[PDB]
Amino acid sequence: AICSALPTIPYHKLADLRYLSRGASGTVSSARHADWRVQVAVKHSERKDVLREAEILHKARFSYILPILGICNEPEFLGIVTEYMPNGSLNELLHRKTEYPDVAWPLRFRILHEIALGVNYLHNMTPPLLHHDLKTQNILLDNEFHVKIADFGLSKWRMGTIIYMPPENYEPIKHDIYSYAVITWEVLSRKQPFEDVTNPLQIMYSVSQGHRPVINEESLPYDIPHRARMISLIESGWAQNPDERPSFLKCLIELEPVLRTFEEITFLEAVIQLK
Amino acid sequence: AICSALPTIPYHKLADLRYLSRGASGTVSSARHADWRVQVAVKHSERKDVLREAEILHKARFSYILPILGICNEPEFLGIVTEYMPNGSLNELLHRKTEYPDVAWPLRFRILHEIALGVNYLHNMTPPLLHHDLKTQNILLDNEFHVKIADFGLSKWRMGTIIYMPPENYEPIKHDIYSYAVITWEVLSRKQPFEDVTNPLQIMYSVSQGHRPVINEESLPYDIPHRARMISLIESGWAQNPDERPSFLKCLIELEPVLRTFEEITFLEAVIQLK
């Protein structure tokens, strides 16, 4: 059995600690490792929850899972130290229509493929790992716009936005496919799911009755490559019946041919068209 | 203490096992993970050597170190399976002058910076890890041309090309800096060190007498950005006296302002210029 212990980073090695965001999972700050001379992201009793998330990221390491660099566990400070994502989250890419006026299909399809690849790897673990928190904010993008899945605070080993939550989860495994289905809608539409509705309880009511973000020419245009394959995936994805929802392997199976259409350069052109 | 065990991959999960290259470290083939649905690279008492290299890649995980995905240890087959590097090695980028006629300075300097960043991280471990094998073939490049250091077969914990080897090791810590400057010379010159020399034993004699790849207008032109800073770095790097050679921190310190000059887009333009 080949083991590896996650490095322990002393707080004093974390210099230029500027804050980035505060969320349910914790507070994200940008630092700079004193020895490694690289920019780093830092998330910071309630200690057990952080040490669990840190264990998850170390175990669930993959090409599309946020790379944990080490842990800061001191009596004064506790925080998860990971790689810094220059181009933030997918939420920012999709909804900053001023900053990012043009976004290309190759990039949008590359992102969707990568999310499925990461979530599929998690589900192929022994025991499987279920994210249970997938949002466009959790799908991070590196300098070359590649997916890095974050927020493993709610994730569980199979042994306040509710817009990505399946309706069965409301009242007291197929959760991630539901979240993925809303994310796939959101990526293709570039629209916020249930924008019309102000009250979150209305959204919850609507979905528990079978309502889902609208599919039409205004929401998802006909110019969308493989539109029918995509809508089929989205609709089966967010099926009211959990047993009717696909596996991520089936998403991969349906996605693989769509992505073979695009030439390797069109993605690099898409990432430059952005900057 | 947060630990992680390296995954064990059954040989039957490695589909489309096609040959890529054969070297001193082993045979590098390309497969495709049957469950993860991603393309991977797999290298294959000789057992003890591979199991050691695998342990090193799992422990030495960093942004510029080749990501190990798992181990195949069966009575029939033994091999390390890692991430697949689409654009191969630095040796290929530098010497395939037909395929890559124009290679921009921002990219060349980004590569040099990243090599130093990865080797510096190795040296900053506890205990430090010394590569002891750095070659342009070992410096791998991903789809977006970012450095991934490989070949940890000769690497050691501080507790058949000889052109990157310091003269003190020929006849039976400052080794990696020596290799790095030869690499830095090679990146900037785009020429093979000791190209005019036929016999490898002659190279070994010449270097032990203080000879190093030539520095002049033919080898390294004046058009090279920060030519003086670079030559100063290279010269100190391959110093005959090991005690005279710098640390990778000093390389980083000297490199940081040179990379400061290049703007973010020029690198993305440089990578697209190749494809």
Ligand SMILES: CN1CCN(CCOc2cc3ncc(-c4cc(N)nc(Cl)c4)n3cc2S(=O)(=O)C(C)(C)C)CC1
């Ligand atoms: C006003 N702008 C804010 C957003 N811009 C900076 C990039 O932003 C980020 C980078 C980042 N790299 C890694 C993380 C991270 C996320 C999670 N969940 N967990 C861990 Cl351990 C690490 N991360 C988070 C943000 S963040 O927190 O700012 C964002 C709001 C984009 C998620 C531009 C300016």
Ligand SMILES: CN1CCN(CCOc2cc3ncc(-c4cc(N)nc(Cl)c4)n3cc2S(=O)(=O)C(C)(C)C)CC1
């Ligand atoms: C111009 N190109 C000619 C051919 N190219 C394809 C094969 O290129 C490769 C990719 C690769 N990805 C990961 C590895 C690897 C290396 C080591 N050391 N260890 C492990 Cl475990 C894995 N690897 C090796 C080669 S390789 O062996 O063919 C090469 C000679 C390029 C290093 C691409 C473009």
